[PDB]
Design a protein around this nucleic acid. Structure first.
Lengths: 50, 154, 98
DNA sequence: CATGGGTGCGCCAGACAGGG
DNA sequence: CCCTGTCTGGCGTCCTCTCACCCCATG
């Protein structure tokens, strides 16, 4: 829902879900591109922490 | 011999990280310890001394190397480095569709209201550069003419 | 240059079909040359009806055929868009030659 | 325009080492 | 293995009434 002004005051769960989906899309694209080992380990580790 | 390594930067300031890295090299004049810098990850041709490691992590807006450990960080394990040479530039290159212009061959439409629809080319016209394919719209086949690039071969 | 041929049998069901596709094109594209018909097509066949004799009982039936052509004038990216998977006439063969 | 990353609390309690 | 020290977690009163302010930043 927005506030008086009009800027949408967004919830925290939307930040969390949007982070997980951004990272998951990045990880699918790197497994498409066949990135090396350390790149996809950091990518999966960032998804795990997300 | 200089081997490759992976550097993590603040994603978005990557060109400025690359420029500041080249400038820190030409400041602290370890010119014989750095080969290139390739562009959120920055590829660095390098050797491993602890002095050069402190140099790259003292470059601003750089988090650190990405490897097995932080004592002896790991050379980028790009086994397909020869394939990455051909991948360079080809990554930023798009292709084109080519309708199967053959009697009875199925094709794909991705342009105009018929986009996202498949059909078969009952007739083909190489001279007029046009394929005669109909689309199953509301059941009835809708024979329409589409260009080779307007449709893709199925 | 864009042709919308319509192929069926009777003129008593295609008559609402030429009304639905010029007016729905008018609300979206408003670019059409008007329906230009084709000569009515007749398939008459005399057939013998007696089961094993009598070459005199020949009753004339016909599968009648009609064709009407719409011919919108300009390739509109709104007429085709709204009237792609849309055709009121049921049991009909539409030929949207683009 | 849209995305990308301090240093003043105190007790209980059980799990994890660490001697013992 | 039997006791001893450490290391992290889990927790701390209820209703109300205003106020002020909520992501830069930028090629």
């Amino acid at each position: 829902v927005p506030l008086d002004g009009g800027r949408f005051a967004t919830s925290d769960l939307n930040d969390l879900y949007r982070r997980v989906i951004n990272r998951n899309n990045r990880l699918k694209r790197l497994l498409d591109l066949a990135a090396p080992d350390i790149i996809v380990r950091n990518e999966k580790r960032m998804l795990q922490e997300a | 011999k200089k081997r490759w390594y992976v550097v993590q930067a603040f994603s978005g300031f990557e060109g400025r990280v690359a420029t500041s890295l080249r400038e820190h090299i030409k400041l602290h004049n370890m010119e014989d310890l750095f080969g290139e810098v390739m562009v959120g990850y920055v590829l660095v041709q390098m050797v491993m001394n602890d002095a050069s490691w402190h140099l790259v992590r003292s470059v601003p807006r750089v988090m650190g190397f990405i490897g097995g450990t932080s004592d002896r960080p790991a050379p980028i394990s790009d086994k397909e480095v020869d394939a990455i040479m051909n991948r360079l530039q080809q990554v930023g290159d798009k292709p084109r569709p080519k309708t199967l212009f053959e009697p009875g061959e199925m094709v794909r439409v991705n342009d105009g209201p018929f986009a996202d629809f498949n059909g078969v080319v009952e007739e083909v016209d190489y001279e007029k550069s046009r394929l005669k394919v109909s689309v199953s719209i509301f059941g009835r086949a809708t024979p329409v003419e589409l260009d080779f690039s307007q449709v893709e071969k199925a | 240059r864009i042709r919308i041929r319509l192929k069926a049998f009777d003129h008593r069901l295609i008559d609402q079909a030429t009304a639905e596709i010029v007016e729905t094109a008018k609300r979206t594209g408003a670019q059409v040359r008007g329906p230009i018909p084709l000569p009515t097509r007749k398939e008459r066949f005399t057939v013998l009806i007696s089961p094993h004799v009598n070459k005199d009982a020949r009753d004339q039936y016909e599968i009648r055929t009609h064709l009407r052509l719409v011919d919108i004038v300009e390739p509109t990216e709104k007429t085709v868009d709204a009237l792609m998977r849309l055709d009121l006439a049921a049991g009909v063969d539409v030929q949207i030659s683009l």
